[PDB]
Design a protein around this nucleic acid. Structure first.
Length: 51
DNA sequence: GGATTACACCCAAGACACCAGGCACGAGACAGAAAAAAACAACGAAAACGGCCACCACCCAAACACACCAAACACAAGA
């Protein structure tokens, strides 16, 4: 694509049925600097949804 | 007999006690226990009948002797 030159090797090419799985990165990316702590231990809480 | 059996992360879903016999008080009845009296043991006082010493006579015990029997050294017999 960059140069239009032929590729020295030939490429196995054709349609294939792919699937969109439920695991998206935007549902997983989590960061925490400081946030809510637990009542008993005063340590950071557990959960991406709970920060 | 107990005790331990990978590590990290994501999401969703339900419950966050209800209801029934024991403690206190709440009052009777035989049993847990207390009070009394009458038939239980003994002792004081009188009555007369059983117990002890006499008197007494007939039945059992001892002496005498009888004849009778059991028995024991030894002169004789015997192997």
């Amino acid at each position: 694509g960059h140069t239009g030159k032929k590729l020295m090797a030939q490429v196995f090419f054709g349609p294939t049925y792919y699937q969109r799985l439920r695991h998206m990165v935007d549902d997983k990316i989590h960061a925490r600097a400081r946030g809510p702590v637990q009542v008993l231990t005063r340590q950071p809480v557990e959960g991406r949804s709970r920060d």
